[PDB]
From a paper:
Although Cdk2 possesses three cysteine residues, numerous Cdk2 crystal structures show that only one (C177) is surface‐exposed. Cys177 on Cdk2(WT) is positioned adjacent to the cyclin‐binding interface, and we next investigated whether covalent modification of this site could affect the holoenzyme's activity.
Intact protein mass spectrometry confirmed that acrylamide 1 mono‐modifies Cdk2(WT), even in the presence of millimolar glutathione, while Cdk2(C177A) was unaffected. Interestingly, Cdk2(WT) completely modified with acrylamide 1 exhibited about 83 % inhibition of kinase activity. Crystallization of 1‐Cdk2(WT) showed that the acrylamide had labeled Cys177 with the ligand bound into a shallow pocket adjacent to the cyclin‐binding interface, interacting with Trp227 and Met233. Although 1‐Cdk2(WT) showed only minor structural deviations from Cdk2(WT) in the region surrounding the ligand, significant distortion was observed around the αC‐helix. The αC‐helix is essential for proper formation of the active Cdk2‐cyclin complex and its displacement is implicit in allosteric modulation of various kinases. Interestingly, while crystallization of 2‐Cdk2(WT) revealed that acrylamides 1 and 2 adopt similar binding conformations, the representative structure from the MD trajectory of 1‐Cdk2(WT) is closer to Cdk2(WT) at the αC‐helix, with only a modest change in global flexibility.
Numbering used by the authors: 2 to 36, 44 to 296
Amino acid sequence: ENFQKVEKIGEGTYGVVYKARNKLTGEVVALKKIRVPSTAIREISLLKELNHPNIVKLLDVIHTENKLYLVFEFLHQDLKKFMDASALTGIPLPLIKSYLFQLLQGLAFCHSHRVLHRDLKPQNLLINTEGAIKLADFGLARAFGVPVRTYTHEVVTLWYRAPEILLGCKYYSTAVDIWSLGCIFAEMVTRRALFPGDSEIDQLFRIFRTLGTPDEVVWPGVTSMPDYKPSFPKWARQDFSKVVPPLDEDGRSLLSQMLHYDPNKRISAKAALAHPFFQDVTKPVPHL
Ligand SMILES: *CCC(=O)N1CCN(C(=O)OC)c2ccccc21
């Protein structure tokens, strides 16, 4: 009872999440109960030191009884809510640019420490009313796995999953997080998810109908992926110009690099921060 419940924030991947108050310090936190493997201990331990202004701070890790409780900094809204609330008008392009720039800085930090997110999605991007955005749950996938359904049976979304994961490669490189952020960038710009698949094969075929069915020219090695089938239909690639209007040419070039099929060709977070799309980046104050 170090922490008093204030209210239920929601249902997470791994257990319930409460906004809570630290009895001694007076601080308000998001307290996640994780529903314990030595993988999970040593991973979580690394994560308490992986601190950066665009990563939601892991304040503490309590391991008591059967359970693991992670205590995080509290932020008041997620990007999924902010996008739904911005549906009529869209998030303004300078704010989209500022958020992408801040998220790439969070990714560049984590990846320089060899830690991946692996399940980036709008629900895991948290914003404050000052203009910042931060990545939540970084590292939890390697600690705990990414399940097919959550503890309350909700389906974990596939919409932001990289194609190498969907084709059954079990080696995750930092490129998986660049793909997910590219999908979120496209969703902020057009106000619709880019590849809203509802099964692994629907997700792959939505990817292939936009970017073309991958072959050994664009992705050497693809036909040796565990789940690759020579019988996948062959779709032609569309132009980006049709996929994310009214994004300008620099943003379309950057998106295209974040969505290359071969993880080895996909742009890194450090290289993305240098892209001319960010020449004019600013830090606007958002409408909440
Ligand atoms: C899933 C393991 C892996 O890293 N692969 C799959 C095979 N592959 C490759 O070149 O095999 C001849 C490949 C190519 C690009 C990215 C990942 C992988």
